[PDB]
């Protein structure tokens, strides 16, 4: 089972002091009986709920194979490494919650393909580079928080970004724009 393999790969790359992934047994037919994983009626993964789990380590690109994933909750851990680009394949995702971690590297432009996304909270990490403009195309976006990162450059105010205020962008490296204090060169 491809979804089970992807989650076993993730387990292999996570460091799990409290053994919250103990039930993640790769030999099973699917991951639907595993704690912190929810499957729908057709035995496909719709949630991964791993907040406050004392996890460290890094994510893996195989997460992008969870094609019916609706909720990815990995908030309040100590996960390092980049946000994989392959997360932009998760087109049924409504909540992407990676906040309160140590993610570094850029926000991938591929997150602009998540057209059903309502919650994007990547705040409290060390993400760098520009806010991808493709995020303004996500018209379902209700809550955006990119605060407490090391982002820089221009902050959009068009598309879905009309709903967002300096609260979403505060305490970054060098953001500029009308929504921020400083205007851009």
């Amino acid at each position: 089972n491809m979804e089970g393999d992807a989650l076993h790969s993730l387990r292999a790359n996570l460091v799990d002091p409290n053994n919250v992934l103990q039930s993640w047994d790769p030999t099973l037919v699917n991951p639907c009986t595993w704690f912190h994983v929810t499957c729908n009626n057709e035995n496909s993964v719709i949630r991964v709920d791993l907040g406050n789990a004392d996890l460290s380590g890094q994510l893996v690109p195989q997460l992008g194979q969870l094609k019916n994933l609706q909720y990815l909750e990995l908030y309040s851990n100590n996960i390092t490494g980049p946000v994989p680009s392959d997360l932009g394949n998760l087109t049924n995702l409504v909540s992407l919650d990676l906040y309160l971690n140590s993610f570094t590297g850029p926000i991938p432009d591929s997150l602009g393909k998540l057209f059903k996304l309502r919650f994007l909270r990547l705040n409290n990490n060390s993400l760098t580079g520009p806010i991808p403009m493709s995020l303004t195309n996500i018209m379902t976006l209700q809550v955006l928080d990119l605060s407490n990162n090391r982002l820089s450059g221009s902050v959009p105010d068009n598309g879905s970004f009309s709903l967002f205020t300096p609260i979403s962008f505060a305490n970054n490296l060098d953001l500029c724009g009308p929504v921020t204090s400083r205007p851009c060169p």
Binding site: G51, Y75, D97, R121, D145, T165, I167
Partner: protein
């Protein structure tokens, strides 16, 4: 945390004859988790920072309280369909500068729409219909960069609609006290 004291003060200052805020308790004082209280949505599941208050149709009365300044991360305020009175506080945008949606419709708010509403720079929606608001519509409303929705119908507003607000339809200004100008009928004709 400031957000817990915001809700404590809001409950203490409003009049609540049907006990609709009875379920709001604060067992750990200022450190109580308030994100599951009715009417409350939080930014995230790790802090008490409130993004929106939806207290619509709760039979609440009294004046809009100063305690809201302690909910400083708030972007959506819906107090519609209650029995609130007094005026729209002129401090409201200094209390809540990050407001995107302000819905105070279906209350009994009097006085005029304060000119300090312009200080809510990020306002997309200003919904004030079915109150007892009087005087002129301040032309400061044209300077709200993001204003996509404006609902001022069923008030006691008078004078000429500012020409900049004519992008909004007639339904937005109807049922007022001899209010005139586009999109409504021409003044005196």
């Amino acid at each position: 945390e400031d957000d817990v004291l915001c809700l404590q003060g809001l409950k203490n200052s409003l009049i609540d004859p049907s006990s609709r805020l009875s379920s709001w308790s604060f067992p750990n004082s200022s450190a109580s988790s308030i994100c599951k209280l009715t009417g409350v949505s939080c930014w995230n599941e790790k802090e008490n920072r409130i993004i929106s208050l939806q207290l619509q149709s709760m039979q609440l009365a009294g004046e809009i309280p100063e305690s809201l300044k302690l909910c400083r991360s708030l972007q959506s305020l819906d107090l519609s369909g209650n029995d609130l009175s007094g005026s729209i506080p002129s401090q409201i945008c200094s209390w809540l500068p990050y407001l995107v949606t302000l819905d105070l419709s279906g209350n009994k708010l009097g006085g005029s729409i304060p000119t300090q509403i312009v200080e809510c720079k990020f306002l997309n929606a200003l919904i004030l219909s079915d109150n007892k608001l009087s005087g002129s519509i301040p032309s400061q409303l044209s300077r709200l960069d993001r204003l996509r929705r404006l609902s001022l119908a069923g008030n006691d507003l008078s004078g000429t609609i500012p020409s900049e607000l004519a992008r909004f339809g007639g339904d937005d200004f109807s049922g007022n006290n001899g209010l005139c100008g586009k999109p409504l009928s021409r003044c005196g004709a």
